[PDB]
């Protein structure tokens, strides 16, 4: 059984990951250029952080030197066309013009957890496997890369999570083939979550899922569809729901 986490978050003007020339990392999707944050950034972003440190843990989850790690992280991708910009800065003497650059985008992320490998790596432990899964959930919901954060204080918090228990690993990145155009009667986040809605409404017509949104801000689906099993209003409650669907489990 695989536990799959769907992740939509908005981010302020900053530069978390850069290449050798310094540019914001960028992939190609849907006929245009996409803003990109590496999966090997979210790893060593969540990993070795203080909030996550709460048989040995953090080895069965993410490996180090035939460890067979049971967590897989994918490349975050923007839901609109990448729009880079370059800032001009000068230096003082208090007694020449350079260039820095930045990008702003809303990213979709995707998390997958293998339960059987996690239990096998726990030497038969089961409460510890669910404990580590919960720990990774609370870490991943509240972790950012430590990029150029002193100058661009990018400390945004998410806007929707849907969790899945499907039979085989499948992402929803193909929902963002068409780039999102902002209309007057909506915003970027609402249209992104609607594009996520009109790809889970399909497939079944053509499994279950727990959904959470903070104080139920941007409800999944723009009708009364049952595209998500339950809609919840807390991060702890969503984690407890995940543990409850795994089995009798208290947080």
């Amino acid at each position: 059984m695989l536990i799959e986490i769907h992740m939509i978050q908005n981010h302020s003007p900053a530069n978390l990951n850069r290449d050798d020339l310094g540019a914001p990392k960028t992939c190609y999707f849907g006929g245009v250029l996409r803003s990109r944050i590496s999966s090997q950034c979210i790893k060593r972003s969540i990993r070795t952080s203080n909030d996550f440190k709460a048989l040995a843990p953090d080895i069965a989850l993410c490996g180090r030197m035939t460890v067979e790690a049971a967590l897989q992280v994918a490349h975050a991708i923007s839901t609109h066309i990448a729009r880079p910009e370059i800032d001009y800065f000068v230096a003082a003497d208090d007694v020449h013009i350079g260039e820095s650059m930045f990008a702003s985008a809303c990213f979709y992320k995707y998390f997958s957890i293998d339960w059987e490998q996690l239990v096998k790596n726990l030497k038969g432990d089961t409460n510890l496997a669910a404990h580590t899964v919960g720990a990774f959930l609370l870490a991943a919901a509240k972790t950012n890369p430590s990029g150029k954060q002193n100058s661009f204080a990018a400390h945004n918090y998410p806007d929707g999570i849907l969790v899945e228990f499907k039979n085989s690993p499948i992402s929803y990145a193909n929902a963002f083939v068409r780039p999102v155009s902002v209309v007057k009667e909506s915003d970027l986040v609402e249209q992104s979550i609607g594009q996520l809605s009109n790809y889970v409404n399909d497939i079944r017509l053509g499994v279950i899922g727990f959904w959470f949104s903070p104080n139920n801000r941007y409800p999944l689906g723009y009708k009364h569809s049952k595209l998500a099993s339950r809609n919840i209003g807390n991060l702890n409650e969503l984690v407890g729901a995940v543990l409850d669907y795994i089995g009798g489990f208290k947080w």
């Binding site: 050798d20 310094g22 540019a23 960028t26 250029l33 880079p84 020449h96």
Partner: protein
């Protein structure tokens, strides 16, 4: 304990019917027209080739029979290596192949590979531990034959091979053993003494047989100790391997005017090496492999224009670490020559650096300039690079025909770099889509 190349099977070849195998040197000389040499790394495929080249040169030297094209190799080649059976041995207390007297500088048999890390190298992409894992005799032979051609410097007091920096290695490819043997048969009046004969001497200032088989290092190669896992080079499950040996460094004396036929030299006589790294610095931009360097050069000094497949081997280095080795194949016939256009084609990386480095507006010192163009350079480069043999001779594809390939990707870039909805936005995109690389001859 006892190992002989003529009898024991080490030559990893693939038959033309579709079955790869490992047969011996005598058997490869026997069949020689229904197979191809099967070695994934360019180094082994070049070294086994040069050893067969030296063998055929010595067989012509002591037999005086040429190998006719589209025919089996001469039969009289076989008994001469049988008579001189004592000169091809891998072990024993006596005459040894690619070995010399032992010494005290004890090193494990891992430095004989440029891709398997040893000493202070980073074993992050290949987890190797010293005096734990070793190589088989076929792998020992393969690592032995690479010292003449890919010997770079080793720090303080240790030099390179006879060619100093190993340059490009260009040769002509064919689909059977006689095919490539028969395309590079040009002999010389002076041969020399190859390395498999008696104790080599520098003597005076070389030739053909002695030129290729120069020994910058001596190797010990002790007997295979009974250590067992499988392998690490070709992964084959095998028997007792060798784990420790000796290597001493032989300096090359000053002078010694030697010209490698496959090697490529520059205007000053220095070697012409690859132009690749892992980083796009202020004086380099990462595009693809450099197939355009040894072209306004091969086409005037050695090799000239001839019909066949020109195989390019580009082996990069810096100090004592290899970074990237690649191969390529291009098709030519000899469709005239424009010296100026070949010169511009030999000088292209500076044009790419100048195209990347251009500021979007204004001008600033130490300005990196448009790094998304640095992202899209490799795709148009690899779309261009399929007809390298057609760009070289200018049959139907030109610099201007190569210029059009950038338009689609670059129009895709212009939307992102100017994501506005003004008249000025689309006009800047139109000016931006007219950026083309410009030719620089010197």
């Amino acid at each position: 304990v006892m190992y002989n190349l003529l009898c024991d099977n080490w030559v990893n070849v693939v038959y033309l019917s579709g079955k790869p195998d490992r047969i011996s040197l005598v058997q490869t000389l026997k069949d020689a027209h229904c197979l191809q040499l099967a070695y994934s790394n360019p180094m082994d495929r070049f070294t086994v080739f040069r050893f067969l080249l030296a063998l055929g040169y010595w067989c012509f030297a002591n037999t005086n029979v040429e190998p006719e094209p589209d025919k089996p190799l001469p039969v009289s080649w076989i008994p001469w290596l049988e008579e001189n059976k004592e000169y091809f041995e891998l072990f024993g207390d006596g005459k040894r192949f690619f070995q010399a007297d032992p010494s005290s500088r004890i090193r494990a048999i891992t430095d004989l590979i440029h891709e398997i890390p040893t000493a202070h190298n980073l074993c992050h992409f290949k987890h190797v531990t010293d005096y734990i894992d070793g190589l088989c005799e076929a792998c020992c032979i393969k690592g032995l034959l690479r010292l003449p051609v890919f010997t770079t410097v080793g720090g303080r007091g240790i030099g390179a091979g006879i060619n100093n920096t190993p340059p490009f290695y260009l040769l002509w490819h064919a689909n059977d053993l006689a095919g490539m043997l028969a395309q590079n048969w040009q002999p010389w009046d002076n041969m020399g003494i190859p390395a498999w004969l008696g104790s080599f001497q520098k003597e005076s200032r070389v030739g053909l047989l002695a030129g290729m088989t120069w020994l910058p290092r001596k190797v010990y190669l002790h007997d295979p100790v009974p250590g067992q896992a499988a392998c690490c080079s070709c992964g084959l499950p095998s028997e007792a391997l060798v784990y420790s040996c000796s290597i001493e460094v032989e300096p090359v004396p000053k002078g010694l005017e030697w010209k490698d036929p496959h090697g490529v030299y520059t205007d000053q006589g220095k070697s012409l090496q690859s132009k690749i790294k892992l980083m796009s610095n202020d004086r380099y931009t990462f595009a693809d492999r450099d197939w355009y360097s040894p072209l306004f050069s091969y086409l005037h000094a050695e090799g000239n224009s001839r019909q066949g497949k020109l195989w390019l081997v580009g082996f990069a280095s810096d100090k004592a670490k290899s970074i990237d080795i690649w191969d390529k194949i291009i098709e030519l016939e000899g469709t005239d020559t424009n010296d100026e256009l070949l010169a511009q084609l030999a000088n292209r990386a500076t044009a790419l650096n100048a195209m990347r480095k251009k500021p979007l507006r204004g001008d600033f010192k130490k300005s990196v300039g448009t790094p998304q163009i640095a992202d899209i350079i490799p795709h148009a480069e690899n779309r261009i690079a399929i007809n390298a043999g057609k760009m070289t001779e200018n049959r139907g594809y030109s610099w201007q025909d190569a210029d059009t390939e950038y338009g689609e990707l670059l129009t895709k870039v212009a939307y992102s770099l100017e994501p506005a909805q003004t008249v000025d936005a689309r006009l800047k995109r139109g000016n931006f889509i007219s950026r083309k690389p410009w030719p620089i001859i010197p």
